[PDB]
Amino acid sequence: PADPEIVEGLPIPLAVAGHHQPAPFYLTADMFGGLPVQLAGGELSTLVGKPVAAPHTHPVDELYLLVSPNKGGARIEVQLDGRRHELLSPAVMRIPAGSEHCFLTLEAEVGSYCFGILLGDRL
Amino acid sequence: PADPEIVEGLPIPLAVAGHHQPAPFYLTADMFGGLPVQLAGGELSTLVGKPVAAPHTHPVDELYLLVSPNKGGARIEVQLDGRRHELLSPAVMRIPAGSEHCFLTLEAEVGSYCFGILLGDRL
Ligand SMILES: [Zn+2]
Ligand SMILES: [Zn+2]
Ligand SMILES: [Zn+2]
Ligand SMILES: [Zn+2]
Ligand SMILES: [Zn+2]
Ligand SMILES: [Zn+2]
To answer: Where does this protein hold Zn(2+) 2 (chains A, B) (predicted)?
Structure first.
């Protein structure tokens, strides 16, 4: 009864440069015969003041998506090649391929999520 | 002070066949000079027992991603060409291009989300 169209074995924690524990992926390049994007992320309520990674880079563009049940329920700081940016939920920020970046949770409620959508199949 | 790398004007509600209110997009094909995927969705806590759409189709493959703060905090029913499937968070389900489908929220907590990731730039 494993259904080839359904993946329940999630997240998929992958070692990523800059991270100190594996990053939680929900879409990987090897799913469903091959995907054109990857997607990692997670719930932020326990991460306020606790960054997941140091400044790091990807060979592909990556979009951050920040959501929370209440409008403005979550806020993150993003460093983009050394320049601080902030996002207030809901928001999306583009991180160009090669840009040294990371994010920090400054505010979150139960149900705040940040996802990174990697526009390619390599890390 | 609009930053070209940040979109705060979200969601973007788009008219979609089968839906009775516009669907909330967070990534659209026209963002950042052109994106190769689109992404729509939202928080499910108020949607238990309330479907967003009738059976409908897309010209591209679409991946459902279901997450919730607690393991198993959310459950959805997906109809795939008339066959009922269920997803327990966290889960991902592939919906092939052309497949008549829809989902129904059967259980959700504060912070449950379902997103559809459309693998292309057309609807
Ligand atoms: Zn099936
Ligand atoms: Zn840590
Ligand atoms: Zn990154
Ligand atoms: Zn800037
Ligand atoms: Zn409705
Ligand atoms: Zn659909």
So the answer is: 19
Of all residues in chain B, the one with the smallest CA distance to A96 is B5
Q: How many residues does chain B have?
A: 123
| Tokens linked to A89 | 């939920």
DSSP B120: S
Supply the DSSP symbol for A48.
Answer: B
Largest CA distance in chain B: 50
**CA proximity to B74, closest of B62, B65, B84:** B65
Rounded to the nearest whole angstrom, what is the distance from the C-alpha of residue A17 to the centroid of ligand 4? 24
Specify the amino acid at residue B72.
G
| Spatial CB neighbours of A59, under 8 Å, sequence gap ≥ 6 | A97, A98, A120, A122, A123
User: Does the distance separating the beta carbons of B113 and A110 come in below 8 Å?
Assistant: no
Using an 8 Å Cβ cutoff, are B25 and B11 in contact? yes
- Tell me the resolution in Å: 1.6
A11, A87, A111 ranked by CB distance to B111: nearest: A111
- Give the integer Cα–Cα distance in Å for A48 and B26: 23
Element (H, E) at B80: strand B75-80
CA–CA separation, A103 and A65 (whole Å): 12
Phi and psi, residue A115, nearest 5°:
-120, 145
